[PDB]
Design a protein around this ligand. Structure first.
Ligand SMILES: Nc1ncnc2c1ncn2[C@@H]1O[C@H](COP(=O)(O)OP(=O)(O)O)[C@@H](O)[C@H]1O
Ligand SMILES: Nc1nc(=O)[nH]cc1C#CCNS(=O)(=O)C1CC1
Length: 283
């Protein structure tokens, strides 16, 4: 049998850099929300103990792909504690709608979906905490997808507190530039002193993203898309770029603005979801 699993995107509704730990990573205060929209992963069970990503993802080698890395990490952890039935294997393909590397957390969502899926399919019996713990080794975006709820995240993004923001409609645009997350986070002028505030203070202050100023200042493609969308609705950067989103109260308004968007926006519309489509699909 073949099972299909959603791999939704995420938005950083806000994002503030509160410092940098010794290991190079930054401590932040951010708010994750999912989009009812993203990739679709299909898994066929194997009995020979192999893991095969059948559909290749452009620019990623098989063993470098987060799908495979999450699959082998799960395999190793389960076999190291006798939770992997003999011969556990899987064929994995992916219908990818999400851009590679745009701050939508696609790859990180792909890893979380594989972990939760294969954990159910192999009957490893691992817990949310264990899965989210393994996901952190793969990336700081991964835990939020593993736990499956919109959340106020701190630390490096793994300290998650479930919260239910309004499920606005979003026009999500991808500027035609690739922004390596290292470039933004290594920039000197990036704010790393934003004061740690309470959720209630953050929920009433104006939402912003501390990385937007650098991304805007260094990539005119990101500046172009931002200037265009801000004429219509509140628009901000998500993650470290390059993607940008604008908030709309209704689907018609959002889609109307997308009908007018020049093609260089590379934009789609999607409703926000406080419950991850993946976890919605596990009930
Ligand atoms: N299945 C995958 N899909 C997308 N990116 C992947 C995948 N596996 C590994 N990656 C890596 O992650 C990067 C893309 O980042 P991604 O998480 O998709 O966007 P962002 O994290 O900027 O929102 C690429 O450098 C690529 O090597
Ligand atoms: N804390 C970090 N320090 C770094 O040096 N690199 C990456 C970090 C992270 C994170 C969690 N995901 S995220 O979407 O909120 C943010 C990446 C935009």
């Amino acid at each position: 049998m073949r099972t299909q699993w959603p791999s939704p995107a995420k938005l950083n509704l806000f994002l503030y850099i509160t410092g940098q730990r010794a290991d190079g990573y930054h401590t932040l205060q951010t708010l994750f929300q999912f989009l009812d929209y993203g990739d679709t992963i299909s898994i066929e069970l194997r009995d020979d103990g192999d893991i095969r990503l059948l559909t290749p993802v452009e620019g990623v080698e098989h063993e470098d792909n987060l799908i495979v890395r999450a699959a082998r990490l799960l395999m190793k952890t389960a076999a190291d504690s006798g939770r992997l039935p003999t011969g556990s294997g899987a064929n994995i393909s992916i219908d990818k709608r999400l851009p590679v590397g745009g701050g939508l957390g696609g790859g990180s969502s792909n890893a979380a979906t594989v972990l939760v899926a294969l954990n159910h399919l192999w009957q490893c019996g691992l817990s949310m905490d264990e899965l989210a713990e393994m996901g952190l080794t793969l990336g700081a975006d991964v835990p939020v997808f593993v736990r499956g709820h919109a959340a106020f995240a701190e630390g490096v993004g793994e300290i998650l507190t479930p919260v239910d923001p309004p499920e606005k409609w979003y026009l999500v645009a991808h500027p035609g530039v690739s922004i390596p997350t290292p470039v933004i986070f290594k920039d000197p002028e990036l704010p790393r002193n934003t004061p740690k505030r309470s959720i209630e203070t953050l929920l009433k202050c104006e939402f912003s993203n501390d990385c937007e100023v650098i991304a805007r200042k260094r990539f005119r493609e990101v500046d172009a898309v931002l200037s265009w969308l801000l004429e219509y609705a509140p628009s901000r950067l998500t993650g470290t770029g390059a993607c940008v989103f604008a908030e709309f109260d209704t689907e018609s308004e959002a889609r109307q603005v997308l009908e007018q968007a020049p093609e260089w926006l590379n934009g789609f519309v999607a409703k926000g979801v406080n419950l991850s489509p993946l976890h919605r699909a596990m009930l």
